[model samples]
Target: AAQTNAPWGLARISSTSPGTSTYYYDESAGQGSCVYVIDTGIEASHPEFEGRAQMVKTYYYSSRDGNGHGTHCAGTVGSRTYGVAKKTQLFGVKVLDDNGSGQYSTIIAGMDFVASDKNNRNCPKGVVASLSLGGGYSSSVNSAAARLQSSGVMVAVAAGNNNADARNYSPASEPSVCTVGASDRYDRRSSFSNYGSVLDIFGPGTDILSTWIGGSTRSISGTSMATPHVAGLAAYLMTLGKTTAASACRYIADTANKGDLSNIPFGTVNLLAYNNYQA
Candidate 1:
């Protein structure tokens, strides 16, 4: 039997049972769905991915991850052990540079590429784009995401790790996008997680263990880490016939674990995403 010991994020979402089973929701593990990580890049050779991750370069930077942030985020999106949607097809859409920074225009270009069906590179329509980067508010960024949403692509972005209002950020404040914050292992809001009405939901991010750059695993934390969990869930929902971005967002909001964050404010408290999938 496969050893249990799944990551806390997976356990909290009920995707896996700690010390027991591999995945609780086997039927809806994102089979036939695709998820795109719009970040630094991914370590395509990472063992946890089992050679399943596809790499695409949206910029001049190599599609290979140098900062390890994108690979870490990708792991939580679809790795065998740490992922929420273990069977989803994972794609790396490099936007950020090796230094873990990129202009908003660059990110917009990446979104445009993913949303375009002209050259999908085998990626299907209604793909979920997971973004773990954030910056100052930009109407262009929000507009790009909105356009993508109109094109049947769902966008998930981090609410930033600045412990302030998520509305102060660009993609997070974008109403058309699903903005995610971080919760710790104990289900409490992380000290660094940004919150506000713009935040859609919370996910396990603190001390999250996932694949690194060099076929290794490491622990990381940020709203960046939390965003992929939602993206993975969005992909899983997509496999369940929720093909539109709006429908996937609705399913996620309607099925979330409500009132779970004790530290979150009352009016601003949205759902804490939980996995109700049982084998």
Candidate 2:
């Protein structure tokens, strides 16, 4: 059955009790949808991700998770009941290895994968790619990510966790990428999130609980965790009929709250109101 109306729900803690009926729920509309995650590889077997993730492609451009950042970010964006967008398909790409770092070539290779997958008409349509990692703006990363974007892939990036003036890395500062910052459950910007006009959106980033390697569970922090929130949100909106990267970006910026936090820096802000927008 095709959805005919918005699947509205309220935001709740990721650990919302099993029986607690928080209005926020995975928009079932994305049950059959797919999104590619270009970052640290995901723990496909985690109970939360068991039947949810479908690894259409897997590559290790760098070492696997030693710091557990990628896994945590994966769980936040697509983890079963706890995730904002739980039902969408996940295509995990491992670019950054165990030490939470990788080389430009490795990152570029991962972007290449996104570009090829998105451009292949034989491949599925409406696939968005989430990049939960970024250092600062660079010509190499920008050029690579632009290739994916122009090919119709919606790429979301973390605005960096430095809490600096947003002078950080490639991809995130790149205008072609949808740079995401972090906010708390109360919709306040986290102290660690970098801010600037380049920052496109904000998502829950503090005290996020997610699955780690070896099937272990843990609570973590970083803009990486917050990035997936928007990624999942984009998937949720895509489920509602947004089929293009531009449409998805518009849906997020238009529907999210505009300003609820007063202490946020000049360029830093919050999603203060949620509005209904047509796809």
Candidate 3:
């Protein structure tokens, strides 16, 4: 990966292969070592991401190009250099095509794929599923996600990029899912990020620079970027032996620099503090 000064954190991949080592060393070592990425198909052939990703075995969700949203989000959570859970293998579920849009049923189908994986290779025995897309709250959708969570898979979702107080949708707003809010490079809440009691935690998202198509790179802003920061941190914290989602949540809260929730939106959350039990 090429190094560049982008506001939001981006991966710098080694020419050899797009492996997760560029980020944390061994965040997803044992116990929990896999993640399901329900988004656009990743740049599977990316020099920085060739052997690192796996397509979830249950369904062929999409064949169209992922445009850039899903790929960018995938890079954030599964990207070798930029992802926090770099060591974790990602299962891609391409619900959205290159147009940057998809139907709710399509996303539901992706979730069903995760829910119905009978074999260990599909949904697998132990894995955390990541979702960066949502379209408001729906009882049906929440029910579907709840079933997945009941199966011992940790679920995470972006709390929308809108600068509103209402939580975004589906998995993000679901009680069983950990809703992620965005923090900027300085650890302030992003100006455009949505906020609410639904927010379980925050992660780096402002001006993050990450992988893109054609070996080029770009810096974009959104809760989308922040989600992976927390996701990686979650994987890292879990590696430190904090297993349950509730435990990880408490660790993140205790380690986060407490601020007037009404004032900031996103910035440096100091995940290392959580890892060390420092405030």
Using lDDT, give the best candidate's number: 1
Enumerate clash totals for all models, in the order shown: 0, 14, 24
- For each of the candidates, the C-alpha root-mean-square deviation to the true structure, in angstroms, is 2.5, 5.2, 6.3
Please write out the lDDT profile of model 2 over residues 1-279, one tens digit for every residue.
Answer: 222221111242222211223434434635645677776677776787867664445455433455566667777667764565677777777787766677878888888887786554232336677888877567888888888777777788888888876655778877776778776665567778888877777766767777788878777767787677777777666666654566676567766666664447875545522313322
Model 1: which residue pairs collide?
A: none
What TM-score goes with each of the models? 0.92, 0.83, 0.78
Candidate 1 or 2, higher lDDT?
1
| lDDT for each residue of candidate 1 in 1-279, tens digit (9 for 90 to 100) | 122677778777764222333445546578767888998888988778887797866595478888899999999999988888887888888898889999888999988888884245454434788989989989998888888777877888899999899888988899978889998877789999999998888888899999898788999899999999989888876776654667766677777888766689665765777666645
lDDT of 1 at 241: 69
Model 3, span 1-279: residue lDDT tens: 222332234221111111122222333332245666677666666654547776653234454234766667667765665565555666677877666676887788788777565236532224666777777778777777777766666677787877775444666777777677776544457787777777777666677766676654567888777776665565555655665544555566665545533344344222311233211
Give each model's whole-structure lDDT: 0.81, 0.65, 0.60
Reference-based lDDT, residue 255, model 2? 65
- TM for candidate 1 is 0.92
Ranking by lDDT: 1, 2, 3
Per-residue lDDT value at 250 in model 3: 55
